[PDB]
Amino acid sequence: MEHVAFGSEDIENTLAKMDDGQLDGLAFGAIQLDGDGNILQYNAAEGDITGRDPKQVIGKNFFKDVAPCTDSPEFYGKFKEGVASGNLNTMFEYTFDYQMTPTKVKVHMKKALSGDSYWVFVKRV
Numbered sequence: 001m002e003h004v005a006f007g008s009e010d011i012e013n014t015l016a017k018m019d020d021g022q023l024d025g026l027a028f029g030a031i032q033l034d035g036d037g038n039i040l041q042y043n044a045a046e047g048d049i050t051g052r053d054p055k056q057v058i059g060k061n062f063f064k065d066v067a068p069c070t071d072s073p074e075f076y077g078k079f080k081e082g083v084a085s086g087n088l089n090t091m092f093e094y095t096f097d098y099q100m101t102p103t104k105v106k107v108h109m110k111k112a113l114s115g116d117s118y119w120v121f122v123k124r125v
């Protein structure tokens with residue numbers, strides 16, 4: 001297993017070195033989005049939590065296609081405020097309930113070290 005703790009202060013530096021295969025060794029869900037919300041990376045732990053097949057969601061828009069329950073001021077609204085500002089670091093609890101059993105999770109959104117990319121980390125609560 002890859003040893004990185006959910007919510008670590010330097011998580012973006014640690015994950016910058018990770019290929020899709022190493023991202024799959026994380027103890028929590030990790031999704032990398034571009035500024036428009038398109039999925040660039042989606043790890044195995046995230047698929048375990050949500051039921052989505054990782055390879056199938058890459059390239060889809062997270063807010064429009066995959067996760068409509070997140071299209072709200074409380075999730076997507078925070079993401080879009082962060083992209084526009086060029087800075088994002090927020091953690092909050094949320095319930096995923098689209099085409100799945102309602103599941104309570106802790107979400108951490110953070111701007112990646114890379115230019116136009118943002119991370120969404122997820123763990124069960």
Ligand SMILES: *C(=O)/C=C/c1ccc(O)cc1
Binds near residue numbers: 046069
């Ligand atoms: C609500 O529509 C949430 C859906 C969802 C959350 C996280 C995922 O990775 C996939 C779908």
